[PDB]
Amino acid sequence: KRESGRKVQSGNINAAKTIADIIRTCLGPKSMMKMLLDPMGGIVMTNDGNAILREIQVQHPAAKSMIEISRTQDEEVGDGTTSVIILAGEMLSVAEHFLEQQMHPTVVISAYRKALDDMISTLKKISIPVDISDSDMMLNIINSSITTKAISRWSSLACNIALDAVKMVQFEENGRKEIDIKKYARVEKIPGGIIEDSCVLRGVMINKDVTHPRMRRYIKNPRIVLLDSSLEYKKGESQTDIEITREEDFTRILQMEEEYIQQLCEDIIQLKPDVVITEKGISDLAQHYLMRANITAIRRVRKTDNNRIARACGARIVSRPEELREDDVGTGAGLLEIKKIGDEYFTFITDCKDPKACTILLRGASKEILSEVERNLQDAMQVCRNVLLDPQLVPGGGASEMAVAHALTEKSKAMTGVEQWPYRAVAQALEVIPRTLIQNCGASTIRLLTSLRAKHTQENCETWGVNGETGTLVDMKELGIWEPLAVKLQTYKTAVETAVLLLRIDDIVSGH
Amino acid sequence: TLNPKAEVARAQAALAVNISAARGLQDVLRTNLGPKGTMKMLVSGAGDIKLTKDGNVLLHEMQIQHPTASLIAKVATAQDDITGDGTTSNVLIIGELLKQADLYISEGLHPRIITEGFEAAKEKALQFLEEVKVSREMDRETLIDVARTSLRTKVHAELADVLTEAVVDSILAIKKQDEPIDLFMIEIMEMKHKSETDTSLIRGLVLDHGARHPDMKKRVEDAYILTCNVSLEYEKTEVNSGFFYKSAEEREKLVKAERKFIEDRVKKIIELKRKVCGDSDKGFVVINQKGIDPFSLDALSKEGIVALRRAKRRNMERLTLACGGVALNSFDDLSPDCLGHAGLVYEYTLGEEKFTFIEKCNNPRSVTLLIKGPNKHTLTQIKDAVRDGLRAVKNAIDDGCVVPGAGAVEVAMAEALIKHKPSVKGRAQLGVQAFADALLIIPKVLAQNSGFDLQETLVKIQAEHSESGQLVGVDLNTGEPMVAAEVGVWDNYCVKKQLLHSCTVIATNILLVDEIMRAGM
Amino acid sequence: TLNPKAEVARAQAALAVNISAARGLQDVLRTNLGPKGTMKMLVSGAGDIKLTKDGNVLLHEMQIQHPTASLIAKVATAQDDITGDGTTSNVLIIGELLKQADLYISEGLHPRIITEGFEAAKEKALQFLEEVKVSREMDRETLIDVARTSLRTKVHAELADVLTEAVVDSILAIKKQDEPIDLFMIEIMEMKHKSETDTSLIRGLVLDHGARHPDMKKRVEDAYILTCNVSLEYEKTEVNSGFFYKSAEEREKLVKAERKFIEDRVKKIIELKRKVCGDSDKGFVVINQKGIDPFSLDALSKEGIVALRRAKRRNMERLTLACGGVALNSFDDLSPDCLGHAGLVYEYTLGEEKFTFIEKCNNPRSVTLLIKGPNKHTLTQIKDAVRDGLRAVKNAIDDGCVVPGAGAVEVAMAEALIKHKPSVKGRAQLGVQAFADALLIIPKVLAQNSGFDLQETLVKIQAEHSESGQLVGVDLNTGEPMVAAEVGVWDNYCVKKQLLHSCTVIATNILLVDEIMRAGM
Ligand SMILES: Nc1ncnc2c1ncn2[C@@H]1O[C@H](COP(=O)(O)OP(=O)(O)O)[C@@H](O)[C@H]1O
Ligand SMILES: Nc1ncnc2c1ncn2[C@@H]1O[C@H](COP(=O)(O)OP(=O)(O)O)[C@@H](O)[C@H]1O
Ligand SMILES: Nc1ncnc2c1ncn2[C@@H]1O[C@H](COP(=O)(O)OP(=O)(O)O)[C@@H](O)[C@H]1O
């Protein structure tokens, strides 16, 4: 029914801790697999933290919050999501100070929020900039995802695709340097070819099919037209259908259907275009004028998809076709091609311009290999987004965790009060990240984690992390495990903000 | 630590659940390894019985109760799709790999350390396979040893010489000048009313539907093959008309006019028959897929034509590439350029049905292997053995290298791994030792099924050492060592190659399983 | 097929029961192997507590539920009486031998074949000791490492350096003239009212009861010790008479008359005192075992004579050898022949009690090891350690050859047995492999108790090889390899020799058990 008292906070901890214990071993390159018993007796042997929790049923609402916060991470950053839940579960797993010591959550939350400002400052100290102009460094950075994948045979290809693609979308002139991979980097697959044939189209590719053969097959100077209205007979304000029974009234309603569709098409062809792109559908009578005009018929193109076209070829959006002025012409466009590349038509309006958007062409030998190349390239685009938004990397392999933990432990010495105890407990929670990397490799956890903390005390904290493959210690200057800063800061805030959230819950109430 | 309506195995006992399933599946399939191995029955529940030793059939068609064991069954499907052999030996090595790993995992060893040893033992075992393979030329004497080695594992040691010569000759007819090979060129037919040993080859092709008229020729020693797809039965009016009648007889009178479009096209058939060698000591055959009217059949039958009707898409496909007759979709464009040619064309009468045979062709690029048996399941068992025998001869021809059998490669690779110090990690050799002992399960099981001691057989073949290339195997009749290359036992290079790639990947992934969770089960 | 009140396991389950018992007993004693190993408690039920790592005490004094495990407990009683060490490691090898045998017995191997492999490996294992045994001459530094190696496994690493020099010098005090060392020459005495680290050696004997009178000399630098066994207290009439009294006063007259039997003899002690060097700068001591009246203690104390009473028979025999005076069974025949000679004879004062010490003897051929501790159980703990440390130095001197420790012999013999093929049959190769992997339990367990990974430690010491005779063992503090000779870690030759002969005999006999029948249980 409901929960109240200390049972709530201790219950939310066991729920969040239980969800993290599932994916404790799903961290690093030597991640362990998980067996998911389907209801029909089947098994899925995935090792992805997002896919595991997505398929698991959870009864506690605290678990739904942990999972729903992880999904929000995937939309922004396709990496480090597993670290959020583990840290959020370890930060909450310290229930000694929470209940056994009878401290109020406001005392704990004030310490967790104080450490978060210190964890953020320490990560910027151990950071390091990157020369984004040199693509060789970004290759080593993007290899964190290409490693242990089938696309390693064309690893450099994936970097040049993702690197150059995000640079086109990056509109730095607006100050904030916003990037939109979902809209301005729309990806579409093309059957045929191989992995090497994968490239980036410098334009906008529409997957519209060819309905008739009377369409422009190859053009050197396209002329694209844009409009939102539909090419059909003007209906009434309501959706009332036209019901007719008298034959004499048919020719009247038919003539009204033909003339208005006729006059609207006559104005579209006055500019001598090569393709009519409309947002809404195009009826059969309207297509009879497009095939007669020897121009391509295109429809069902969204607003943002049309906005990129006007920036590419120089077209102009109009409400209706009747108001089409001479400005709506795609002069300077590269070419218009509706070739059937791999048993599927593809509209290419590429040009020699970068209209703050592009389209990625995924060539491949089969749908299985195409999907493998697809999901592997999206993460590379996001790593390029995170580095280009904030070109600062921090040492990975558990080094940034141990480096930050030493700063809090040394800073807690001057922390007079009861908040020093949970403030230090957050530092010991960061050690769980190398604790799992060492557990997966099989090396002794206590022996290496003890020596690992000693290296950060004496030697510089910017290096001396952990090697997940070998298990021994290694400097991140010698091993390119450097991860972005924006991923770690958002990973650290989301873990503390999530733990602060569940700690603020004291009564699970039902009602609507 | 779990939500309601679910379950979770947190500790390492989840791994023991997967090890127990593989150990159980090992003990099931080990009794059907090799020729002397037993057979397993597949009761479909409806009442159909089926006996077979093919591990792919005992895992794909047989549904497995345990959830974990069904995963390994899907791999046997994947193993059969690449090489078509080794599915049984794949499961036995997986069962022993996980068995040997549990001995060290119980001592506190992590699974990830053992899997890194398998990756090292695989590369060493893969390099040693390159040295043992024999790249000799493939001759009829060699492929017979391959076909016998592949067919004796699926039959009662009586259909060996029967299906061996058929399986070998079927392949040699479809490869010359280093051309790429395709097993789809060989058709597999099944017929009853004869003993199991009545299997033989068919150089031509078998057709289902035969001629239907008393005046037909039972055999045509020569004829031009005319491919067609036009319905010579009663069809609708082909012109813009309808049914303008006043009674039933007037409706029937218009059907005569509707038959004018078909009846005249029958004369066009008779015309080209009389034109293209319609003289004495000659014949003509029509293979029209669609139906033919009884009255129209009377016209062609009296002219000495052996007509056929209501054929399948597969028959017309092979009939075209074999005979060369191009399909005419309308008799208006009838011409002699679309005509083929063939030798003997006859219909062998069985006790119940009949089938048309088009044997004695020059180079049809397609043949047929006619299987004969008394029962239904026996024909299916022989169909599987031929497909496994053809794919075995295919691999030996495509991949010109072959390797010895009878566990001689497994015994040699195991000795090489033991004679291999660590190179990736100190503790990795524990997995290399487990990989070595896992390979020895193959000669161990061959000694069990043959009825000999498991330990005496393996120790004798291991003691064979000399200052020269020496590869001994398990003699199923004697039990003593036996040079598999001398007696004529040869396995493919892709079979042993894919075993190491398939065994290591699955034995690795099953070891990396830390927890077993219910996804709403 | 069975009779009432009878049960028998005809199948191989009798081995699975006996093998399971050894594995259980293995897991119990493996935690107390070495100095880093944990201790076991021995609750007698009445409330007494006793802590000890000595496997013989954990098998002789403790009670075991399993009947099969009680057989192995009796073996430790035999192993202790012959060598004095190796009872714990004897049980580990039996469990690991039976563990490896069960792995092969499940594969259909007969038990008798495995026992033949042990007999072949055992004979080869014994020869390896003769090659690696170091016949170093017995000196102080060598025995310190041996006694340290034994005493550290029974104490908290604090009494080791204290007890080491004492146990070494105790044997050297009695070791001379190439005589066989007798442990009866060293008596072990305990004392409360002091801490544990106050243990030290006493050159002479120590007695419980001492002089109790104010007029006694606190220390006697020299004296003619008189050995006697005559009671100087109220005794019965020794002449042809008896006791007849009429009242309490007439009874008191019989005491005065009966006391004259002693009063004439108490002055006899004063006579021989004045007789044999009664001048100045001399002394006299009486060690009469029987009771002495306070009158005689009061009389002789005025003459300056230390008289003792209520001693043991064994102490009187040791006292005669220390002094030289033969025991006089009757004071009437007193003479100087019954006298001896000794040096400083003082009295050690504790908080409550006081003890007699006869240090500075001439030729006792015997010493005493004075143990001191605060608790009762701590005295029994240290006593069991010194008895084990004494036998360790005894075996090192009785058998001048020693061998390394830290499992260095087991790691070496394991590699030696692997490089050795049979000579009776091939299947004995499996038993030799089980013997090889069984000896490695000792270096495996030492890594567990020290808190290090079982596999990393063994692989390092086993991988360490060179082009020369090189030893290698487990470093309990660091976990890295360690040459035992370069650090002072040595075992005995008879211990390792009896270990191989003991484990092979019992692991053999346990494997030959085909059935377990209840004799009316
Ligand atoms: N090659 C490597 N060596 C050492 N540590 C690595 C390596 N690759 C990734 N890691 C570590 O593993 C952690 C998880 O990485 P990743 O799998 O990319 O994210 P997630 O586990 O959230 O999916 C990171 O914090 C990183 O420090
Ligand atoms: N004369 C023959 N002698 C010894 N072993 C044989 C012989 N023929 C086949 N074998 C063994 O039988 C095993 C199984 O063969 P096969 O049935 O083709 O594969 P699978 O059992 O995996 O389907 C092979 O590993 C091979 O070594
Ligand atoms: N510091 C040490 N380093 C290496 N090995 C040791 C050390 N101390 C003891 N050992 C080993 O522990 C073993 C057991 O010693 P001990 O307790 O005397 O016999 P048991 O365990 O059979 O009663 C010996 O074989 C010895 O080699």
SS3 string of B326-366?
Answer: CCECCHHHCCHHHECCECCEEEEECCCCEEEECCCCCCCCC
**Burial class of A22 by CB neighbour count within 10 A (0 to 12, 13 to 18, 19+):** buried
Place of tokens 């370069």: C486
What is the Cα–Cα distance from C412 to A439, expressed in whole angstroms?
A: 32
Rounded Cα distance, A407 and B516, in Å:
39
Q: Do B513 and A34 touch (CB under 8 A)?
A: yes
Q: How far apart are CA A271 and CA A328, in angstroms?
A: 8
State which amino acid sits at residue C166. Answer: A
Dihedral (Cα; C141, C147, C150, C153), 10-degree rounding: -90
Exposure b/e, A361-378, CB count within 10 A at least 16 = b: bbbbeeeebbebbbebbb
Alpha-carbon span C341 to C348, nearest angstrom: 20
Does B492 contact chain A (CB < 8 Å)? Answer: no
Pairing of strands B219-220, B481-483: unpaired
H or E element, residue A128 = strand A128-129
Q: Which segments within C320-424 are labelled E, that is strand?
A: 345-349, 354-357, 367-372, 402-404
Respond yes or no: is residue A379 known to be catalytic.
Answer: yes
Element of type H or E holding A359: strand A358-362
Amino acid occupying residue C422 = P
Q: Flag whether residue C257 sits within 8 Å of chain B, measured between CB atoms.
A: no
Return the DSSP state at C48: -
Residues of C in contact with B429 (CB under 8 A): 459
Distance in Å, CA C431 to ligand 3 centroid:
26
Among B68, B87, B368, B504, the active-site one is: B87
User: B52 - beta bridge partners?
Assistant: B40
Residue of B111, B104, B54 lying closest to B79 (CA atoms): B54
Reading phi first (left if > 0) and then psi (alpha if -120 to 50, else beta), residue C49 is in beta
**B90 C-beta neighbours (distance < 10 Å), count:** 26
Instruction: Give the integer Cα–Cα distance in Å for A81 and A73.
Output: 6
With tokens 């058998």, the residue in question is C399
User: How far, rounded to the nearest angstrom, does the alpha carbon of residue C184 sit from its chain's CA centroid?
Assistant: 11
**Chain A neighbors of B18, CB-CB under 8 A:** 35
Residue C11: CB atoms within 10 A of its CB come to: 9
Ligand 1 site residues, Cβ closer than 6 angstroms: A 27-29, 49, 79-83, 144, 396-397, 433, 437, 467-468, 481, 483
B293 is catalytic: no
Q: Which two tokens stand for residue B38?
A: 């037993």
Residue with tokens 């239907």: B212
CA distance linking residue A27 with residue A84, whole number of Å: 11
Count of beta carbons in the 10 Å neighbourhood of residue C303: 13
Both tokens of B251, joined, read 């409706």
Rg (CA), chain C: 30
Resolution (in Å) of the shown entry? 3.3
What is the token pair recorded at B81? 């799709």
H helices then E strands: how many in chain B? 17, 18
Q: Which two tokens stand for residue C384?
A: 């069991």
Three-class secondary structure of residue A177 per DSSP: coil
Contacts of B among chains (3+ CB pairs under 8 A):
A, C
The encoded tokens of residue A166 equal 């995000």
Q: Is-catalytic flag, A390?
A: no
Spatial neighbors of C144 by CB under 8 A, at least 6 apart, are C164, C165, C168, C488
| Cα–Cα distance for residue pair B368/B205, rounded to 1 Å | 6
Signed CA dihedral, C52, C54, C59, C60: sign only: negative
The DSSP call for residue B252 is H
Cβ proximity of B382 and B155 under 8 Å: yes
Q: Are C453 and C447 in contact (CB under 8 A)?
A: yes
With a 6 Å cutoff on the Cβ, whether B18 touches ligand 2 is no
CA B215 to CA B304: how far, in whole Å? 8
Taking a C-beta distance cutoff of 8 angstroms, is the pair B418, C433 a contact? no
The beta strand positions in C241-352, using DSSP E, are: 284-286, 305-307, 345-349
Residue type at A135 in one-letter notation? S
C429–B459 CB contact, under 8 Å? yes
The span from the CA of B407 to the CA of A168, in Å, is: 60
- In single-letter form, the type of residue at position A10 comes to S
Question: What tokens were used for B280?
Answer: 């004495």
Neighbours of C236 (CB within 10 A): 8
CB B190, CB B368: distance < 8 Å: no
For A60, residues 6+ apart whose C-beta sits below 8 A from its C-beta are A11, A12, A15, B3
CA A507 – CA C25 distance, rounded (Å): 53
What three-state secondary structure class fits C203?
coil
C-alpha distance from B67 to closest chain A C-alpha (Å): 6
Which residue, judged by its Cα, is nearest atom 8 of ligand 2?
Answer: B149
Subunits with 3+ Cβ pairs within 8 Å of A are B, C
Nearest CA to B492 among B393, B406, B413? B393
Hey, is C354 helix, strand or coil? strand
**CB within 8 Å: B519 and A32:** no
Q: How far apart are the first and last CA of chain B?
A: 17
Which of C446, C457, C500 for mutating ligand 3's site (highest number of atoms within 8 Å of CB)? C446
Which residue reads 């389907």 in tokens?
A: A38
* DSSP single-letter state for residue A417: S
- As a whole number of angstroms, the distance between CA C24 and CA A86 comes to 39
d(CA A51, CA C298): 99
**CB within 8 Å of A321: residues ≥ 6 apart:** A227, A229, A231, A264, A265, A267, A268
Measured CA to CA, the distance from residue A224 to residue A230 in angstroms comes to 16
Whole-angstrom CA distances from B83 to B78, B259, B391 are 9, 55, 7
* Spatial distance between the Cα atoms of B173 and B162, rounded to a whole number of angstroms: 18
Nearest residue (by CA) to ligand 2, atom 12, is B34
Closest chain A residue to the Cα of B509, Cα to Cα: A33
Q: Are A161 and A377 within 8 A, CB to CB?
A: yes
Closest CA to C225 of C66, C108, C361, C105: C361
Give the list of residues 6+ apart from residue B227 with CB closer than 8 angstroms, or none: B287, B288, B316, B319, B320, B323, B325, B326, B327, B328, B338, B340
For residue B517, give the nearest of A35, A442, A470 by CB distance.
A35
Contact B379, B373 (CB under 8 A): yes
Taking the alpha carbons of C105, C109, C112, C116 in that order, is the dihedral positive or negative?
negative
How many CB atoms lie under 10 A from the CB of residue A52?
22
Determined by which method?
cryo-EM
> What is the Cα C260 distance to its own chain's centre?
49
Q: What distances in angstroms separate CA A414 from CA A123, A298, A430, B371, one per listed residue?
A: 20, 69, 21, 91
**Set of chain B residues whose Cβ sits within 8 Å of the Cβ of A30:** 112
B405 labeled part of a ligand binding site: no
Residue type present at position C217: K
Alpha-carbon gap, residue A365 to B321, rounded angstroms: 29
A14 and B3: CB-CB below 8 Å? no
**What crossing angle do the helices spanning B111-132 and B87-105 adopt, rounded to 10°?**
140
Instruction: For residue A50, give both structure tokens.
Output: 């997002």
CA distances from C18 to A432, B93, C89, C102 (A): 44, 31, 18, 11
Structure tokens of A199? 């490239």
- Strand, coil or helix: A511: coil
Q: Which of residues 448-507 of C touch B (CB under 8 A)?
A: 453-456, 459-460, 463
Q: After which residues is chain B broken (C to N over 2.5 A)?
A: none
Structural Rg of chain A based on CA atoms:
29
Nearby residues of A230 by Cβ (< 8 Å), 6 or more positions away: A278, A280, A281, A282, A283
Mutation pick for ligand 1 pocket among A71, A481, A482 (CB with most ligand atoms within 8 Å): A481
Q: Most distant CA pair in chain B: distance in Å? A: 102
**Exposure class string for C422-439: b at 16+ Cβ within 10 A, else e:** beeebbbbbbbbbbbbbb
Gap from B109 CA to chain A (nearest CA, Å): 8
In the numeric block, which tokens belong to residue C449?
A: 């108790």
Shortest Cα–Cα distance, A463 to chain C (Å) = 26
Q: What is the Cα–Cα distance from C479 to C483, expressed in whole angstroms?
A: 12
CA angle in degrees (0–180, nearest 5) for B396-B402-B403: 145
Flag if B1 and A14 touch (Cβ within 8 Å).
yes
Let me know: does A496 contact A115? Beta carbons within 8 Å.
Answer: yes
Long-range (24+ apart) CB contacts under 8 A made by C81-85 are: C82/C494, C82/C498, C83/C391, C83/C395, C83/C492, C83/C494, C83/C495, C83/C498, C84/C387, C84/C388, C84/C391, C84/C392, C84/C394, C84/C395, C84/C495, C85/C150, C85/C388, C85/C391, C85/C392, C85/C395, C85/C491, C85/C492, C85/C495
* Beta strands C186-191 and A358-362, pairing class: unpaired
- Whose CA is closest to A496, among A433, A410, A432, A426? A426
In sequence order, the 6+-apart residues with CB closer than 8 A to the CB of A334 are A202, A203, A222, A349, A350, A351, A352
Q: Which helix (H) or strand (E) holds B492?
A: strand B490-492
For A360, the 3-state DSSP assignment is strand
Strand partners, A348: A205, A337
The dihedral through the CA atoms of B479, B484, B488, B490 has a sign that is positive
**Dihedral (CA of A258, A259, A265, A270) sign:** positive
The answer to whether the CB of C193 falls within 8 A of the CB of C373 is: no
Q: Diameter of chain A by CA atoms?
A: 99
Q: How far is CA A292 from CA A177, A226, A269, C156, in A?
A: 46, 19, 10, 103
Q: What is the 3-state secondary structure (H, E, C) of A286-312?
A: HHHHHHHCCCEEECCCCHHHHHHHHHH
β-pairing, C51-52 vs C40-41, is: antiparallel
